[PDB]
């Protein structure tokens, strides 16, 4: 198009890593300004 | 060396069939199985470092 590239979405290696780590008892959660949630997996993790 | 590693593997299973074969007719197939020797030798000429 000759346009300006969008701004990066989370890299799959990270996503692949969090779950790898989730495979292990450990729970890796990303957090916000005040320690609260944020979502790396855009919407496939919430259930149903 | 590998040929004798394979001979042991064959001799391993052949001893199991000394007990498996009902009566005397057990010389041919009751004692020999070419599976080990093949995998062993083969393994050496295509996979050995």
């Amino acid at each position: 198009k000759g346009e300006d590239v969008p701004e990066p979405s989370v890299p799959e290696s990270f996503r692949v890593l969090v779950k790898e780590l989730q495979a292990l008892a450990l729970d890796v959660q990303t957090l916000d300004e005040k320690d609260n949630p944020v979502d790396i997996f855009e919407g496939l993790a919430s259930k149903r | 060396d590998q040929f004798r590693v394979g001979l042991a593997r064959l001799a391993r299973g052949v001893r199991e069939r000394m007990l498996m074969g009902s009566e005397d007719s057990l010389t041919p197939a009751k004692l020999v199985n070419s599976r080990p020797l093949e995998a062993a030798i083969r393994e050496f000429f295509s996979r050995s470092q």
Binding site: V5, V10, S13, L17, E20, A25, Q29, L31, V38 | -
Partner: protein, 1303 residues
């Protein structure tokens, strides 16, 4: 849509295992061959993990994107691509618990330390083998009251539940000596042969007697109790409240004897193994043990209090962060996604699946078989035997190898890659993220010199470009008439014979002002990658500029360089502004240029500027007679006086020719009157200068490169042949004086002429060119005969077997060095212009030791071990190096090659470790106000016992160049202000002053004393950006430092540097004086002794036989002073002389090695690093948290600052400076992400989990993994926000403000 600013590892709640979970994998069914579809509920079922297909469902009720977020009414399939299949998780519900191997086998057993059990052996004892525990209450005895938390066995537990049951068989036809339910005591004969072993009630079996620790209460009317129920003293049993029990216990209503026996054992709750630890873990009230430990900690002696302190941190971290410790036990195993571990079709029908599945099967199978083995009937031995295998299985998926190594059946004795394996190591998962390994717009080919090219550009193969800038080209095709659309333009290019010449026009046009990055094999420093303007060229090879060949270690025997392309208009910006070649001329290590003319350039630029000398046989005195002018000018015309004679004022060569204007001089050259290397007279701007044409020509080239002709002679020396150094210094000067890009112009200028002059010069190696000194024959014979004297001196018995050897070595060691200066002496006096020689003298190519091996002789080559050979290598390479001398010399070459191989690995590793600790260090500031500076010494103590000396020019320069004075210093007349950055010239001043004797030290800001916790400021770092002005805020200094140290290392030696970055106890230790008084020595036989003493006390220093002490009986010895000779132990020196001493020790002692090897790196760097070695300290007087603790220095400065300043109550937080090595500081830092990268991913995470650790992302390592923007650089909070304006939009916005006035 928010930004991920903090990541956090926390333990998993079983409920959370279920929460992230989709379905439960309950059967070992991979995929059934007939249909490559997921078998049943199994490991790959799509419910549990996700849509096997695109957007479509199961059966196909809904098949596109319109209803993307809804599930099929009849079948539950929500869909995105099959990615929802690769991100979802499934869980397996284990039968009886098992524990994480990550928490149980880490050196410090997180559960062993928390739970006071034998840290490593009691665990392994009951975890994998057989021992059981009692939960709330169990009123009856074993001998003692109920064990609230202790553990019992199945046999003594068995006995308890049915009373005291022990069955006693009786031989057929034999009658017993007791009645059906008679009270039997321990030792009583229950029959002739049988004898009871315990008290209780003898019950009849059909054949056998079963005694029971119990009482027996007969009843006439019906029973109110039932077999199995528990009873206490009082509890009714039968006949109404008439028959009551008297003891706690189980019940057995025997209606065969119409009686109710109450076996001694009542309500007893019981369970063992992971089961036993799950119980204990649940019953602990962390608060209580916390308090308990507090007391234990500060009150008893150091043995049990020290244990309580290491036992209090874990309890702490749990309560503190929140996420409680009962989840350390596994009862729900999370199943990694399906797509992650590939079930793929290989060849002919072969299928490959990630080994993880084999281990998952293992666990599933065992858990199931266990479920079945407990429901069928449970014989103890077989239950444990399985729980064991079970427990081992659980390890397998988590971590294989900690304990034994599982293998796929006979095929490959290979450990199935366990989850730990996937997350750790060199090529692991944590390493794949951090280094992010494969670019989309990349390329690589063989490089080839591009002489005409300017540092600004690089020759890139058009064919390479076409693919590289393909999408950018496609669009441009459409902008023009070559192609209708993108897909069109693509097909147009899918074949090589289809490219219209018009496409090249388009590409040539698309790369117009864009630039690409080039990479070299090992990326040692920031210049390991540089940006250039691609100038499309034909062929395979990539044209690289010669001057940059120095930055990337690259010659042209086949080295290949990679190529990337900046996609964003932002990336391109930075890439061409701050990453291009021509703007990064100086090196980040030293303020010396890196665009120095290389070997080829210098050879050319040298040749042209040298003066020749020829023959003086007749008088050389024109200085005085006028008849000397005439006579020696006619004598020259004759054959007697040369054109370049040693004739003080002017050799006839100057008398004959005088040149007015500058040009005048070179025309005569071109006409064959004067060689360029000849000595003539010339009239310049205001002087009659006596200098050779060549020298004058060089003057012009520079003067032309940069038009400010006067400023060109101000910074050049035409009084000597241009050496790599004279040139090196001309670049540097030119950089400071005239400006960056103008310098770049000068470089290419020299580059161009150096190269041209080079070809014309005709310098070439010839066999005869290597010239052997006539003195070689002498020195060898002279030393030969002397060797006989040494032999005759031993054949008599005067010299010891050793003395003989050491003396002979010294004969050659000197004789060889003798031939060395001899050869050069020959070239200097007789062949000034020898091909081999000139190359070596000119910064070009050659090494004094090398030349020797060709014309002189390469004499001593050591044996395999190291002991040098007694016989030397009498030959040169000019003449036949003989058969054996070759072999003999071979041994050394081989050790050299092996050495180079192991140094390369260790050089990259050192760069890894330096980065592991200094990556976070970045410049983000405001002049940090804490003025605590470092003083750069200019003089050194002991070379010779004690004599003060001026440190080397080099060394001192290394210490004060481009630094920021801490305080004002009035030296030789000038007033060096505070905060001023001393230029090289300024550091030339201070040395000249110390010469006079006005200054011994220099107050200067340094990273060693910065206040900025995470980071370093502008005034503290200093000058050296790649540019010569002060450091710009937002420069990754940590790395830049780590790199400048890791490159030179490959030249080192290194073993010491390691001992130094890593606080260690070197080979030859030197006892440091912990006390400062004076010294004194003793004479007794065995051991000597150096004592630092006072009439009050002495610090006894045991100095064995081999140790050489140089402090003598008599004078003073400050704390941490060398009392022995050699290396020192940082820890002791820290204790004795203090931290300000360790830091400065480390620094100087590290520089010692590179100095001695030619490397010239600025102290700044080793400081950055060493600082981090000490970013931690121990605590001795608590406030917030308990005493023994190793925490971040500055985080205490925070604590103490607000505890005394903002909130009252001066609870002084007394700490102790702690010294740690680069490696341990990285291992143990704040964030875990960084730590997960090197040490042990296994440990790092364990702890970080336990204590819900919130990784506040600061530093470039941790924040790179996330693929998030770098906290340093443009992500620099200083410049991440900066807007631009046009006076036109400035007025328009003001018009927006004006419209704000209502009505």
């Amino acid at each position: 849509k928010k930004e991920v600013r903090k990541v956090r590892i926390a333990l998993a709640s079983p409920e959370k295992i279920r929460s992230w979970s989709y379905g439960e994998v309950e059967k070992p069914e991979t995929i059934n061959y007939r249909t490559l579809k997921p078998e049943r509920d199994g490991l790959f079922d799509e419910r549990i993990f996700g849509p096997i297909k695109d957007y479509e469902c199961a059966c196909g009720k809904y098949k596109r994107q319109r209803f993307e977020g809804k599930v099929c009414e009849r079948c539950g399939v929500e869909v995105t691509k099959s990615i929802v299949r690769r991100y979802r998780m499934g869980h397996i519900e284990l039968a009886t618990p098992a524990a994480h191997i990550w928490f149980v086998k880490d050196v410090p057993s997180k559960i062993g330390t928390l739970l006071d059990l034998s840290a490593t052996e009691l665990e392994q004892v009951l975890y994998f083998s057989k021992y059981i525990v009692l939960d709330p209450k169990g009123a009856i005895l074993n001998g003692v009251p109920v064990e609230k938390r202790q553990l019992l066995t199945d046999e003594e537990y068995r006995e308890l539940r049915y009373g005291k049951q022990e069955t006693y068989p009786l031989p057929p036809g034999v009658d017993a000596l007791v009645k059906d339910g008679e009270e039997v005591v321990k030792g009583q004969e229950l029959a002739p042969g049988v004898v009871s072993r315990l008290d209780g009630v003898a019950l009849y079996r059909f054949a056998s007697i079963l005694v029971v620790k119990a009482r027996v209460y007969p009843f006439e009317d019906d029973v109110e109790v039932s077999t199995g129920d528990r009873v206490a003293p009082g509890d009714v049993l039968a006949d109404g409240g008439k028959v009551k029990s008297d003891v706690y216990g189980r019940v057995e209503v025997d209606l065969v004897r119409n009686v109710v026996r109450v076996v001694e054992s009542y309500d007893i709750d019981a369970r063992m193994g992971a089961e036993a630890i799950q119980q204990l873990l649940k019953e602990l009230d962390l608060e209580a043990l916390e308090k308990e430990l507090l007391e234990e900690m500060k009150h008893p002696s150091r043995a049990r209090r020290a244990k309580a302190r290491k036992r209090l941190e874990v309890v702490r971290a749990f309560l503190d962060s929140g996420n409680r410790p009962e989840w350390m036990i596994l009862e729900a195993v999370p199943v990694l996604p399906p797509d992650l571990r590939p079930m793929v079709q290989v060849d002919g029908g072969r299928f490959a699946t990630s080994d993880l599945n084999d281990l998952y099967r293992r666990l599933i199978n065992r858990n199931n078989r266990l479920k079945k083995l407990l429901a069928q009937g449970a014989p103890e031995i077989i239950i444990r035997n399985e729980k064991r295998m079970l427990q081992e299985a659980v390890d397998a998926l988590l971590d294989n190898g900690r304990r034994g190594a599982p293998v796929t059946n006979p095929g490959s004795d290979r450990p199935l890659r366990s989850l730990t394996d996937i997350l750790s190591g060199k090529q692991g998962r944590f390493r794949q993220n951090l280094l992010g390994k494969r670019v989309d717009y990349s390329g690589r080919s063989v490089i080839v010199v591009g002489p005409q090219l300017k540092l600004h550009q690089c020759g890139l193969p058009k064919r390479m470009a076409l693919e590289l800038f393909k999408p950018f080209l496609l669009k441009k095709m459409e902008e023009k008439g070559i192609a209708p659309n993108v897909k069109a333009a693509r097909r147009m290019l899918e074949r090589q014979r289809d490219i219209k010449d018009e496409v090249w026009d388009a590409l040539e046009e698309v790369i117009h002002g864009k630039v690409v990055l080039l990479n070299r094999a090992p990326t040692l420093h920031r210049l390991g990658i540089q940006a250039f303007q691609p100038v499309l060229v034909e062929g395979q090879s990539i044209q690289l500029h010669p001057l940059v060949c120095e930055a990337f270690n690259a010659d042209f025997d086949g080295d290949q360089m990679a190529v990337h392309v900046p996609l964003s208009s932002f990336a391109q910006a930075e890439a061409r502004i701050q990453m291009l070649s021509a703007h990064n001329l100086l090196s980040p290590a030293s303020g010396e240029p890196l665009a120095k003319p290389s070997r080829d350039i210098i050879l050319g630029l040298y040749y042209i500027t040298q003066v020749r000398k020829e023959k003086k046989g007749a008088g050389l005195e024109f200085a005085t007679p006028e008849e000397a002018l005439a006579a020696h000018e006619r004598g020259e015309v004759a054959l007697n006086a040369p054109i370049k004679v040693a004739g003080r004022e002017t050799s006839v060569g100057r008398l004959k020719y005088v040149f007015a204007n500058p040009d005048e001089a070179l025309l005569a050259v071109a006409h064959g009157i004067v060689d360029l290397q000849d000595v003539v007279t010339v009239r310049y701007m205001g002087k009659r200068l006596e200098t050779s044409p060549g020298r004058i020509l060089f003057a012009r080239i520079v003067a032309e490169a940069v038009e400010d002709e006067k400023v060109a002679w101000e910074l050049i020396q035409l009084d000597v042949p241009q050496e790599k150094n004279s040139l090196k210094d001309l670049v540097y000067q030119a950089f400071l004086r005239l400006g960056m890009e103008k310098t770049a112009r000068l470089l290419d200028a020299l580059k161009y002429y150096g190269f041209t002059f080079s070809t014309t010069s005709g310098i070439t190696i010839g066999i005869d060119d290597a010239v052997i000194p006539e003195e070689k024959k002498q020195y060898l014979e002279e030393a030969d005969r002397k060797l006989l004297q040494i032999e005759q001196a031993y054949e008599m018995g005067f010299l010891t077997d050793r003395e003989r050897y050491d003396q002979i070595l010294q004969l050659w060691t000197e004789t060889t060095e003798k031939v060395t200066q001899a050869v050069f002496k020959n070239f200097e006096e007789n062949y000034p212009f020898n091909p081999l020689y000139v190359m070596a003298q000119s910064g070009a190519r050659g090494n004094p030791q090398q030349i020797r091996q060709l014309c002189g002789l390469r004499g001593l080559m050591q044996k395999p071990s190291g002991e040098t050979f007694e016989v030397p290598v009498r030959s040169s390479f000019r003449e036949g190096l003989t058969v054996l001398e070759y072999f003999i010399s071979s041994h050394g070459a081989r050790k050299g090659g092996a050495d180079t191989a192991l140094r390369t690995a260790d050089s990259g590793y050192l760069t890894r470790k330096l980065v592991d600790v200094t990556h976070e260090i970045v410049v983000r500031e405001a002049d940090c106000g804490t003025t605590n500076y470092i003083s750069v010494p200019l003089f050194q103590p002991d070379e010779v016992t004690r004599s003060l000396r001026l440190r080397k020019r080099a060394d001192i320069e290394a210490g004060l160049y481009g630094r920021v004075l801490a305080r004002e210093v009035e030296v030789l007349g000038v007033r060096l202000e505070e905060g001023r950055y001393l230029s090289m010239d300024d550091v030339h001043l201070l040395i000249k002053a110390a010469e006079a004797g006005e200054i011994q030290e220099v107050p200067v800001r340094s990273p060693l004393t910065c206040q900025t916790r995470y980071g370093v400021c502008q005034k503290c770092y200093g000058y050296d950006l790649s540019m010569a002005r002060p450091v710009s805020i937002g420069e990754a200094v940590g790395i830049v430092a780590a790199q400048s140290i890791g490159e030179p290392g490959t030249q080192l030696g290194l073993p010491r540097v390691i001992e130094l970055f890593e606080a260690r106890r070197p080979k030859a230790k030197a006892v440091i004086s912990e006390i400062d008084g004076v010294v004194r020595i003793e004479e007794t036989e065995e051991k000597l002794s150096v004592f630092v003493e006072s009439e009050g006390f002495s610090k006894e220093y045991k100095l064995p036989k081999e140790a050489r002490l140089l402090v003598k009986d008599g004078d003073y010895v400050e704390a941490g002073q060398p009392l022995t000779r050699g290396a020192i132990d940082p820890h002791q020196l820290l204790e004795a002389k203090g931290p300000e001493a360790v830091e400065r020790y480390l620094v100087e002692e590290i520089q010692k090695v590179y100095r001695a090897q030619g490397v010239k790196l600025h102290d700044k760097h080793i400081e950055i690093v060493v600082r981090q070695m000490m970013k931690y300290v121990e605590v001795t007087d608590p406030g917030d948290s308990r005493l023994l603790e190793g925490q971040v220095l500055e985080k205490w400065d925070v604590e103490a600052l607000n505890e005394r300043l903002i909130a009252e109550g001066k609870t002084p937080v007394a700490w102790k400076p702690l010294l740690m090595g680069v490696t341990k500081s990285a291992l143990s830092t704040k964030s875990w992400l960084s730590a997960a990268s090197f040490q042990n991913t296994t440990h790092v995470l364990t702890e970080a989990a336990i204590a819900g650790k919130k990784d506040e992302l600061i530093g470039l390592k941790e924040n790179v993994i996330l693929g998030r923007l770098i906290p340093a650089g443009t992500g620099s909070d200083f410049v991440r926000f900066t807007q631009v304006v046009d006076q036109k939009t400035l007025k328009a916005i003001e018009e927006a403000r004006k419209e704000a006035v209502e009505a």
